[PDB]
């Protein structure tokens, strides 16, 4: 006994799918013919792409798989006229966020400028993207090496940095002379 008859569907699964009857039985969260193409549930976010079941794939720089953390990573400029960005340059890496709320200068590229307090908080603060609570930033942490002297600590709505004698902190370019 032999036969050239398929004993099953005719056409392809992937993805978890059951091939059975014409159409491919989709895994969870799976749609298509051959179920290759998964459900972006809450929303692909930062120009990404739908990979698994709301597992959308994320470009760059969004901390948790759901990319809605839109911190990218920039060098923060300090000061900006149509003439330089800063002049002496900074792998400084923070947030734009950062960079506007506190210091208030520009960051990223090419050079994206604005001003310093954007929400009607204070400056060194950043409202919670859970409480929605102004905190302040260890901006002495969040923005590293922004001060130029001796010590840095933090206040809230403001850094303190601590100069040696005779030196004078210059908050306009974080310098200590
Ligand atoms: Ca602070």
């Given at each position: 006994?032999?036969?050239?008859?398929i004993?099953?569907?005719?056409?392809?699964?992937?993805?978890?799918?059951?091939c059975?009857?014409?159409?491919?039985?989709?895994?969870?969260?799976?749609?298509?013919?051959?179920?290759?193409?998964?459900?972006?549930?809450?929303?692909?976010?930062?120009?990404?792409?739908?990979?698994?079941?709301?597992?959308?794939?994320?470009?760059?720089?969004?901390?948790?798989?759901?990319?809605?953390?839109?911190?990218?990573?920039?060098?923060?400029?300090?000061?900006?006229?149509?003439?330089?960005?800063?002049?002496?340059?900074?792998?400084?890496?923070?947030?734009?966020?950062?960079?506007?709320?506190?210091?208030?200068?520009?960051?990223?590229?090419?050079?994206?400028?604005?001003?310093?307090?954007?929400?009607?908080?204070?400056?060194?603060?950043?409202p919670?993207?859970?409480?929605?609570?102004?905190?302040?930033?260890?901006?002495?942490?969040?923005?590293?090496?922004?001060?130029?002297?001796?010590?840095?600590?933090?206040?809230?709505?403001?850094?303190?940095?601590?100069?040696?004698?005779?030196?004078?902190?210059?908050?306009?370019?974080?310098?200590?002379?």
């Amino acid at each position: 006994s032999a036969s050239r008859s398929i004993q099953h569907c005719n056409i392809r699964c992937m993805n978890g799918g059951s091939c059975s009857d014409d159409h491919c039985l989709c895994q969870k969260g799976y749609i298509g013919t051959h179920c290759g193409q998964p459900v972006c549930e809450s929303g692909c976010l930062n120009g990404g792409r739908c990979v698994a079941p709301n597992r959308c794939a994320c470009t760059y720089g969004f901390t948790g798989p759901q990319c809605e953390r839109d911190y990218r990573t920039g060098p923060c400029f300090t000061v900006i006229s149509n003439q330089m960005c800063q002049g002496q340059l900074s792998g400084i890496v923070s947030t734009k966020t950062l960079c506007c709320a506190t210091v208030g200068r520009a960051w990223g590229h090419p050079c994206e400028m604005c001003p310093a307090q954007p929400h009607p908080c204070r400056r060194g603060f950043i409202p919670n993207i859970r409480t929605g609570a102004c905190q302040d930033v260890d901006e002495c942490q969040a923005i590293p090496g922004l001060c130029q002297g001796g010590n840095c600590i933090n206040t809230v709505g403001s850094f303190e940095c601590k100069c040696p004698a005779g030196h004078k902190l210059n908050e306009v370019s974080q310098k200590c002379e």
